[PDB]
């Protein structure tokens, strides 16, 4: 009677992990999706994992039918991918488990390996194929890959069990300032590849100040002596890459036009190896820090930014391509050259669109507030998510900063945890800057945090005029501080319910929010070491912490309403500043 | 930064407990309810307990307003008491926290102590009054009492934070076979009493075989020497009780008509002590076991029973008086003299109506499936709920059996935990029988479980013809067993979706369910040691484990549909059996 | 290309008919229903019958999948039995085909024959089992039986294709004055019987004027020599019946209390033959005609009647038991001893409830208006429906009159068709009277119709004061006529929209309807040869011919509104008349 008497029914599924080490490079690969209607059940008590519905035991050993608690083909249907919270109002506040199943046929036209990719599933995803357990993924915003070659038949049943439960030891914890959207909400794909295939492919301008050297790195699925053929036709590049034990790299001379948000030049690149082919569309640029300067392609820059969550009234966390394009267009209308994508990895199409339309990006993992920094398995979770993100987005010129977390306490255990993450980012990616968003040192009203020593760029969150209501605290904060690194003010802002007006002293009104922006900008614009800002936030987003009548379960710090149809007065305050900077160059 | 960086934000509230030791006797006490509209928020991340909204800190020390995430008087309103899951479809699957608040005025007309009673709140209830923490209750089906005398002002604000979260270490665990209804779902009351008041009052027929002696026990809120006076005018009784250190008892002669379900005679009793008065309405009966016989008032009985959950389509767990009367009336129409109230304490009005209308009762605590038997604090939770139940219902003649749990594994840790619970019940109540529902010993197909040694009556659950599909296992089971004490078959049955028909071999149909009842009765009715049965169950109830098309998130073992408007064929099978037994006397 | 180029795709299904000759007697037989949720499609073009979906050809001979236009297990679900028109507003006016399918398991515990019964399906029902065609039924209001023994497997799929299409050559034609309710709307059953089983059982009081002799006739499924034994324990009866070639009968002495509506005495009767047993619950009464007198148990009666359709706002033609009880109770409150069930066989439970509650009945087949009297296959359809009705209801004491049709033209072809139907009824049932509802002879304003010669009782429809607006035509009609047999006025009345008032000259108002009843009763009550009346009608019913603002697609001649919650003034006019007759005895 283990289905009712087994206390630790999940331990048996802690195997077959999808991790950064099972990802494959997808550029240029044809994929068949499993998007569509899946039969589903709400599984509030995790009954599928206790009773093992995926085994489909309908009769006992003696031929008697047994009672069952599921009916796969007669279950209702839900269109995947989606955040299930926005499918039906009954599911808005549901954060337990749902079980999804469908069938598909499989015929190999040649010898091939097949991966299942789940583009994102929050928070846990357990995979079953033809009655057998494939494995699981932990972490709610990164793609998960499993080699399913050995499970496939001519006709298949796949089951996905997805648990939205919040837990203090997860990354993030159970307490955040955003909405817990659950389910399988980015594309589900089948990827056929040769037995010997390209597993990783990384390419970048070498950040040596000459703008004339390009590095490319390849690893294969097998330890083999081989070569790859790299082609960049527009740059006249055709170079051999020699592979030893399935890995190799090359550095070669080239003269690309350097990518900027204003001139987002991209190049088609193609790599062959054995019978395999991949391709990408990549820009070349150098991002460095020199003293207090942020240098893009050798030139100091001011990052005119805005923060942005992955939220949608209709789609929850599963934004469409159109919604991503809208966010970039509105940010550029606002005058931005930079966007802070908070607080987790967004859909990879965001950085691809930023590559194409021209917008610098900061990408982040949800090491947020009271992470269990002492727990080794929590470190393993965080480091895997960091490395998944870096591996997924390595070739995105638009991305210039990896952030290892946000608003964590300055304790010994936090410093060990997050400094090692910062070292991990640097080791995984020699081309990009590493940052994090820190709280103000309240005792000294000072930019001072032990983590900052390990960062290329300091992010500081401050809410003077709001959570720190006395505006005079802001000039004092900047006078008290003299960092030797560039500073991005990674958050400031104020709530305003759309169309809620009052005096500038009425916190929560449009007038007060615009007044906060006026005072913030008047101080920050003349601090020499502040080299950017990403005010919180582009538009209102669902938020379980905000319950007042002038919040209505949305964080109201957006410069636009939650459907992005309406611009609040503070939008035009920030825009006027950014357009001034643009006019000055 | 405590509200965002404190990991263990709940430890500070582990104080001011409501327990069996803070209960007061309520019979004959005037109460003022706080039922009504309460302003409320969905508090998914427990923000109220982290930010301490109940302190209502609206300005800082320098007079600046600070942003806040709540608005008590402008929140929407929910009528309490209720299960919040049936209030709106958005809350059906919500099992986090909600925060409720309202105001009330208080004027003492004489010196008095005041208790707050929360009739039931699942699972945790934290109480705040005028910005101060009063305390909390743990356990989802028993009434909670706090002395609030020292918190009261002329105008008051009360805040209740109620957490529906399921946890493995709770009682029950996170895995049950019933629906997790959450909220404050029985009466909220203010109770004014003298400073020295009657704290407990227990009265029962002495089970000495004469039916002519009555015991009465009183304790006071103060450890003093005093006399109480007990009056039963209809029986010519007036007796003093000498109290010492706040406690005393007396045994006296009386000639009551003995309570039975067929003739449920009740008597008004009144007790005074100092300036305090309490009263009750009680029946007098003797319940004993002799060998394999269950004896009511000296005569062997067969308990023609049905099991029953506290479930309602419209009201969730917060059944109305009319719904309880309906359940009793339908049970009696079915031919029952007995009902198993599963698996937790029902509203105390159930046993009061059973006293009045005439139905014998089994009441139970949710020590169900995989309880953390090794954890001392889990034992403390279970023991407290057991003692709350017994103290609440001590004077209910209809209740004859306390059950200490259901379908637990026969392990050493379980045995230590549940045998000590059974000893607790025996020590707390010398007048009633103790039982539990046990699984069949699958190794021997036998009624054999180490806990049975500690019980007066053996409860056995068996599902031959259903989960044990071979009917032949049932005669084998009864042949293999020769218990020395009475056996109640506390569960058997089969799913049937209302109006879903098929052949008797189609599991899940009405015809198969009726066939299972026919074969169960044919065997059970001729087993000498089976003195009762409570088939599972009177009517269909919400059940998160049952997801098939012929279940629809209801357990379908009811003899009636979930609205009790429709009787399935198996209803008449059982009814015919019970009416034969009644015909025979 | 058969599914697209075959013009006559239905001819292949004109086989395996369910007819009166395949019916079996059901009294006392255990049945397993197939009522429940069936997966279904709207099949507007009869694609299932052209493409043969029931063969489930999913792959071609080379193993390729082929496209299909159905998905049995993933279709939506409809609860059967029902009139599909009242299931959803989208189906109210749908009268094409629908396809229903489900599965069921079958295990024979002994050698047995199995019948499928479809209690009623309007108009055509085609049956498929495990991919094979079983057969079909024609006729929308009678039960259909097919021997499916040789089709059954351990796991079965049944498909029912049901066509509601109206056709001029059907019985009824495409033009009626009632609503075309479609679908399988009475119980679907599986019936297990011995190979040699009792096929028909008929029992009645011998109409020889002694009231002391009972006849009983039995036929078997096999043409063998055997004895049956008949028992009526309450009357001290036990008699053998000698069967030869599968058939025999017996007449025996018995002293039953004679059934009347006021004292509806019934008796349990049981018949055994070999291993088979059937039983029934029957009353004993004599119905005869002598001159102009209708004699019940030897006494002249006046039939205080009302007409009644099988109509329900919520359920369409699939009335519940409660709705039938309501119709009988309201008729008796109106003062009726008699009801005309128009214009087709109602659920057989109607006459069983009339047996029990006490109401005399007229039952009728829908040979209505412009039947294709010249077409032999239309005659075959009508004769079969008549014989199905008579075989179904032979043992119902409440039924005293079989009606062979309604308001047909007095032509030579009609006379040949309907007189042979009347001879059929007489030959099939020696115990009951035969009638029909005839139009007034408009040339003579006279009761005169060539079919009346073949009837025991004359039914005349007349609408003086309504369709014949001059009331003076009614006394003229009765003056012009001097029939030699009893006359029942089988229809009169007037529209009244509930709560629609006006002057007595406003046709369509309550006042005018009451005025018509006053004048009808004033004349009819003093005509010597009028021995009964069944005014049209008890309550408003759906009617596609009535489109005015004061009709709203209902026939408004009811004495009550369509939900039977409201009694119009004419209700009390008729009630006052019937209670005067009852007062007089
Ligand atoms: Ni406005
Ligand atoms: Ni039914
Ligand atoms: Ni009126």
From TrEMBL, chains A, B, C:
GO annotation, biological process: carbohydrate metabolic process; glucuronoside catabolic process
Glycoside hydrolase family 2 immunoglobulin-like beta-sandwich domain ranges (all copies): 197-285
Annotated ranges, domain Glycosyl hydrolases family 2 sugar binding: 34-194
Keywords assigned: Glycosidase, Hydrolase
InterPro entries in alphabetical order: Beta-gal/glucu_dom_sf, Galactose-bd-like_sf, GH, Glyco_hydro_2, Glyco_hydro_2_AS, Glyco_hydro_2_cat, Glyco_hydro_2_N, Ig-like_fold
Pfam families: Glyco_hydro_2, Glyco_hydro_2_C, Glyco_hydro_2_N
Uppermost EC category: hydrolase
EC number(s) per entry: 3.2.1.31
Domain Glycoside hydrolase family 2 catalytic: 287-581
Signal sequence annotation: none
Entry annotated with the keyword Hydrolase: yes
Gene Ontology MF term list: beta-glucuronidase activity; carbohydrate binding
Family recorded in the similarity comment: Belongs to the glycosyl hydrolase 2 family.
Protein name as catalogued: Beta-glucuronidase
